[PDB]
Amino acid sequence: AKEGKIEIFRHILQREFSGPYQPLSRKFTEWCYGPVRVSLYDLSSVDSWEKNSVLEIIAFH
Amino acid sequence: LVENGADVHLRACGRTCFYFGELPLSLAACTKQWDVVTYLLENPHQPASLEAT
């Protein structure tokens, strides 16, 4: 996040693995009624009770 | 669910939705399902209505 590199940064954020490697995923798909998808993203990129988060690094550093 | 007995005019609205239509026939038509639509209006002793509201 600090040094540009948008492609790998995007891949790490939206990382979904189906199979025996479920625990090392970041985006979990959930119940899908009709054409409506409901995704669950993980939040290690929030400044709430997290000093030196991804948002601050993108914004300032 | 139809052969034993049900209502084919069960309106579904009380307002995560995409407005498929408050009637079951509209739901079966909006989603690409020819078999369900074909089964309706023909087989049930009390079939659906193609001009429902």
mmCIF file of C-alpha atoms in Angstrom:
data_model
loop_
_atom_site.group_PDB
_atom_site.id
_atom_site.type_symbol
_atom_site.label_atom_id
_atom_site.label_comp_id
_atom_site.label_asym_id
_atom_site.label_seq_id
_atom_site.Cartn_x
_atom_site.Cartn_y
_atom_site.Cartn_z
ATOM 1 C CA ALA A 1 0.000 0.000 0.000
ATOM 2 C CA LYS A 2 2.861 2.427 0.696
ATOM 3 C CA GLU A 3 4.599 2.027 -2.679
ATOM 4 C CA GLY A 4 1.847 2.087 -5.283
ATOM 5 C CA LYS A 5 1.675 -1.381 -6.852
ATOM 6 C CA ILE A 6 -2.081 -1.374 -7.348
ATOM 7 C CA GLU A 7 -2.351 -4.875 -8.827
ATOM 8 C CA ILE A 8 -0.935 -6.891 -5.925
ATOM 9 C CA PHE A 9 -2.625 -4.568 -3.414
ATOM 10 C CA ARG A 10 -5.994 -5.214 -5.063
ATOM 11 C CA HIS A 11 -5.369 -8.962 -5.238
ATOM 12 C CA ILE A 12 -4.546 -9.186 -1.528
ATOM 13 C CA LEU A 13 -7.703 -7.280 -0.551
ATOM 14 C CA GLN A 14 -10.108 -9.275 -2.749
ATOM 15 C CA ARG A 15 -8.642 -12.722 -2.112
ATOM 16 C CA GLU A 16 -11.059 -15.671 -2.070
ATOM 17 C CA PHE A 17 -10.026 -19.338 -1.857
ATOM 18 C CA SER A 18 -12.611 -22.124 -2.104
ATOM 19 C CA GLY A 19 -11.664 -25.556 -0.806
ATOM 20 C CA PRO A 20 -9.370 -26.784 1.969
ATOM 21 C CA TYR A 21 -7.655 -23.356 2.008
ATOM 22 C CA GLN A 22 -10.725 -21.463 3.239
ATOM 23 C CA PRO A 23 -9.141 -19.879 6.371
ATOM 24 C CA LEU A 24 -6.583 -17.926 4.313
ATOM 25 C CA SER A 25 -9.203 -15.913 2.433
ATOM 26 C CA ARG A 26 -10.181 -12.269 2.779
ATOM 27 C CA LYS A 27 -13.495 -11.933 0.894
ATOM 28 C CA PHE A 28 -16.178 -14.457 1.882
ATOM 29 C CA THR A 29 -19.199 -14.826 -0.368
ATOM 30 C CA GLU A 30 -22.484 -15.326 1.477
ATOM 31 C CA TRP A 31 -26.164 -16.062 0.821
ATOM 32 C CA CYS A 32 -27.140 -15.083 -2.723
ATOM 33 C CA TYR A 33 -30.870 -14.641 -3.371
ATOM 34 C CA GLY A 34 -31.415 -14.161 -7.089
ATOM 35 C CA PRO A 35 -28.925 -11.856 -8.812
ATOM 36 C CA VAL A 36 -28.048 -10.230 -5.458
ATOM 37 C CA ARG A 37 -24.579 -10.998 -4.089
ATOM 38 C CA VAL A 38 -23.579 -10.315 -0.474
ATOM 39 C CA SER A 39 -19.827 -10.202 0.178
ATOM 40 C CA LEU A 40 -18.053 -10.079 3.545
ATOM 41 C CA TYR A 41 -14.703 -8.302 3.389
ATOM 42 C CA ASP A 42 -12.171 -8.448 6.209
ATOM 43 C CA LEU A 43 -11.040 -5.270 7.972
ATOM 44 C CA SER A 44 -7.376 -5.050 8.862
ATOM 45 C CA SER A 45 -7.356 -1.747 6.932
ATOM 46 C CA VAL A 46 -9.305 0.425 9.384
ATOM 47 C CA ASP A 47 -7.946 3.089 11.731
ATOM 48 C CA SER A 48 -10.464 2.216 14.472
ATOM 49 C CA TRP A 49 -8.244 1.038 17.354
ATOM 50 C CA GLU A 50 -5.483 0.272 14.808
ATOM 51 C CA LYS A 51 -2.568 2.700 14.840
ATOM 52 C CA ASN A 52 -0.721 2.888 11.506
ATOM 53 C CA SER A 53 -3.452 1.358 9.351
ATOM 54 C CA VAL A 54 -3.737 1.082 5.578
ATOM 55 C CA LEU A 55 -5.962 4.163 5.340
ATOM 56 C CA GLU A 56 -3.386 6.394 7.046
ATOM 57 C CA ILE A 57 -0.531 4.962 4.964
ATOM 58 C CA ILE A 58 -2.431 5.639 1.738
ATOM 59 C CA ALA A 59 -3.515 9.095 2.900
ATOM 60 C CA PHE A 60 -0.301 10.381 4.508
ATOM 61 C CA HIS A 61 2.765 8.133 4.092
ATOM 62 C CA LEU B 1 -46.601 -27.695 -3.383
ATOM 63 C CA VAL B 2 -49.249 -27.123 -6.075
ATOM 64 C CA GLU B 3 -50.735 -30.618 -6.422
ATOM 65 C CA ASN B 4 -51.606 -30.947 -2.728
ATOM 66 C CA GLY B 5 -53.032 -27.421 -2.698
ATOM 67 C CA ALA B 6 -51.770 -23.850 -2.360
ATOM 68 C CA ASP B 7 -52.438 -20.293 -3.553
ATOM 69 C CA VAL B 8 -50.801 -19.134 -6.786
ATOM 70 C CA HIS B 9 -51.655 -15.508 -5.967
ATOM 71 C CA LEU B 10 -49.618 -15.140 -2.766
ATOM 72 C CA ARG B 11 -48.513 -11.516 -2.991
ATOM 73 C CA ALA B 12 -45.008 -11.028 -1.559
ATOM 74 C CA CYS B 13 -44.359 -7.450 -0.434
ATOM 75 C CA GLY B 14 -44.112 -5.677 2.905
ATOM 76 C CA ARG B 15 -41.886 -2.731 2.018
ATOM 77 C CA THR B 16 -31.929 -6.669 -0.248
ATOM 78 C CA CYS B 17 -34.536 -7.001 -3.002
ATOM 79 C CA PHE B 18 -34.437 -6.507 -6.769
ATOM 80 C CA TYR B 19 -38.215 -6.138 -7.384
ATOM 81 C CA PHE B 20 -38.905 -9.423 -9.129
ATOM 82 C CA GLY B 21 -42.653 -8.787 -8.929
ATOM 83 C CA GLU B 22 -45.047 -9.474 -6.074
ATOM 84 C CA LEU B 23 -46.618 -12.495 -7.797
ATOM 85 C CA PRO B 24 -45.027 -15.969 -8.022
ATOM 86 C CA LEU B 25 -45.549 -16.076 -11.797
ATOM 87 C CA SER B 26 -43.577 -12.847 -12.171
ATOM 88 C CA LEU B 27 -40.819 -14.386 -10.039
ATOM 89 C CA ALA B 28 -40.746 -17.482 -12.252
ATOM 90 C CA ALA B 29 -40.664 -15.303 -15.384
ATOM 91 C CA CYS B 30 -38.018 -12.754 -14.337
ATOM 92 C CA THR B 31 -35.619 -15.577 -13.514
ATOM 93 C CA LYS B 32 -34.950 -17.534 -16.699
ATOM 94 C CA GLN B 33 -37.014 -20.647 -15.937
ATOM 95 C CA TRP B 34 -39.153 -21.878 -18.827
ATOM 96 C CA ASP B 35 -40.128 -25.128 -17.095
ATOM 97 C CA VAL B 36 -41.846 -23.445 -14.138
ATOM 98 C CA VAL B 37 -43.780 -21.029 -16.362
ATOM 99 C CA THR B 38 -44.821 -23.863 -18.680
ATOM 100 C CA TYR B 39 -45.997 -25.972 -15.733
ATOM 101 C CA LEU B 40 -48.051 -23.033 -14.493
ATOM 102 C CA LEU B 41 -51.199 -21.929 -16.360
ATOM 103 C CA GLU B 42 -51.603 -25.473 -17.737
ATOM 104 C CA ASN B 43 -51.384 -28.283 -15.150
ATOM 105 C CA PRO B 44 -52.966 -27.028 -11.882
ATOM 106 C CA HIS B 45 -56.707 -27.460 -11.465
ATOM 107 C CA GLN B 46 -56.694 -23.789 -10.439
ATOM 108 C CA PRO B 47 -53.965 -22.294 -12.663
ATOM 109 C CA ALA B 48 -52.412 -18.848 -12.388
ATOM 110 C CA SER B 49 -53.604 -15.820 -14.374
ATOM 111 C CA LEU B 50 -51.414 -14.260 -17.057
ATOM 112 C CA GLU B 51 -53.123 -10.888 -16.428
ATOM 113 C CA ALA B 52 -52.590 -10.721 -12.662
ATOM 114 C CA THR B 53 -51.721 -7.480 -10.881
#
